[PDB]
Design a protein around this nucleic acid. Structure first.
Length: 464
DNA sequence: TTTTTTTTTTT
């Protein structure tokens, strides 16, 4: 039988490729989300070349020390996660996971000699994200479920706010599992209150399932939901697919039909290209370019035209007319599509860890890495295999120097400290201080928080 | 199998 898999991370920072993980959580589930298997949780040892960015530690409450003690080396952290995720017929998911938690999962596998995509592709493996489903469910069919309004009075879509607003427990928040359960809790709330909707979002999660909606030459008007539209509009507005992104066929070029199209008609690409790369403030007394890219491969909420009903669009405030007129004009303008699609025809990182998306690895290397996966820590020095990619030869030096310091050789050991020297440069460390200071000054009142700010400096000493 | 500015989200 096919299964879901609700997972969650706790990291030492936002950026997946640079900031490292700290904790993991996961639960296997059936077609109706009921709890199969043993709840799995590990910790990840932070290597001797990285300092957690305070903000992460303050909100997680998880110090590196704790992780160094409780946790396994990143290789095992990967392996153990890879082994859960490689299970066939699985829909691996979480909250914001596609935007975040999964990326980490990629960079981990990338770092530790694995396929960072296969886990959500090979042997009938898919993925999903409830965050969009919440926004959608509020936007279109909010019957039954509660949604919390903020200070100003706009709907929140935090897990911590949605849980407390739906009876689900979230004492001990930002605790790997506590989320993973409270994450499942919502799926059963959406399959209950609007399975009508749920199955729609679900079945159309896959790439090939989305093309059904996207009619490009004729520009069929679809309903879309992203946080990018913002809470003020209920994260919703109709869109018309102009074209497939020139340099990235995983992206479709859409038009916000709720906005003011005229710029598209009354400017050239090189201005529009400036006007959409213009920020929300310095676009002064003008209109904003109502264009956006929807990425098909990222479980986007795409629905059929009439899905959004007059009962809903009135509740929200989106102006049916404007979107139609604008469509009429867009279909009556076969050159809007000309420049807009030109815009996206203008095309680099230095650190190997962030060098994930430099294409893919050739079948020659795919083997060569899988063979490095066979080699026991002993023989990594010994084995002679040729590599096409320059990224691997680098990755292998780090891989050993973090996960297996015992394997290091007299020279390597001193190259590693010379790396650590280039990493931990005086002023760079000073920053860390200024930050810790400023924060402890900010969070001076609290003792339990400061307790961490202390520990991070303690860590920042001994590690250096 | 893959990636500048919206907006909100997770750590």
């Amino acid at each position: 039988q096919s299964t879901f898999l609700f997972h969650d991370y706790e990291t030492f920072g936002t950026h997946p490729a640079l900031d490292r993980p700290a904790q993991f959580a996961a639960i296997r589930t059936d077609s109706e989300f009921n709890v199969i298997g043993e709840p799995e949780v590990f910790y990840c040892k932070p290597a001797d070349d990285y300092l957690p960015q305070p903000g992460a530690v303050l909100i997680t409450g998880i110090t590196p020390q704790e992780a160094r003690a409780k946790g396994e080396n990143e290789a095992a952290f990967a392996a153990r996660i890879h082994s859960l995720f490689t299970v066939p017929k699985t829909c691996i998911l979480g909250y914001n996971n596609v935007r975040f938690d999964d990326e980490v999962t990629r960079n981990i596998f990338y770092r530790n000699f694995y396929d960072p995509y296969a886990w959500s592709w090979q042997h009938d493996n898919s993925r999903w994200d409830l965050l969009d489903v919440m926004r959608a469910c509020y936007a279109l069919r909010p019957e039954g479920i509660n949604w919390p309004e903020n200070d100003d009075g706009l709907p929140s879509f935090r897990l911590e706010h949605l849980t407390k607003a739906n009876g689900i427990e979230h004492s001990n928040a930002h605790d790997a599992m506590a989320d993973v359960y409270a994450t499942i809790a919502m799926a059963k709330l959406v399959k209950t209150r609007q399975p009508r909707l749920f199955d729609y979002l679900f079945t159309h999660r896959n790439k090939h399932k989305l093309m059904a909606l996207i009619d490009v030459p004729q520009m069929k008007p679809l309903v879309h939901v992203s946080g990018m539209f913002g809470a003020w509009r209920g994260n919703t507005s109709w869109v018309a697919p102009l074209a497939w992104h020139p340099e990235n066929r995983n992206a479709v070029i859409m038009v916000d039909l709720a906005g003011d199209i005229s710029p598209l008609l009354e400017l050239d690409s090189d201005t529009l290209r400036e006007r959409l790369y213009t920020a929300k403030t310095d676009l002064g007394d003008n209109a904003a370019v109502p264009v956006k890219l929807v990425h098909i491969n990222k479980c986007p909420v795409l629905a059929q035209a009439n899905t959004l009903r007059p009962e809903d669009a009135d509740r929200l405030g989106i102006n049916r007319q404007h979107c139609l007129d604008n469509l009429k004009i867009l279909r009556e303008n076969p050159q809007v599509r000309e420049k807009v699609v030109a815009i996206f025809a203008e095309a680099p990182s230095d650190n190997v860890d962030a060098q994930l998306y430099n294409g893919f690895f050739s079948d020659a290397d795919r083997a060569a890495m899988k063979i490095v996966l066979e080699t026991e820590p002993r023989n990594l020095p010994a084995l002679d295999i040729t590599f096409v990619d320059k990224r691997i030869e680098k990755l292998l030096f780090n891989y050993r120097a973090r996960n297996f310091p015992g394997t290091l050789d007299y020279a390597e050991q001193q190259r590693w400290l010379e790396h650590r020297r280039q990493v931990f440069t005086p002023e760079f460390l000073q920053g860390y201080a200024d930050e810790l200071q400023m924060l402890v000054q900010q969070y001076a009142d609290d003792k339990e928080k400061v307790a961490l700010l202390k520990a991070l400096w303690q860590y920042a000493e001994e590690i250096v």
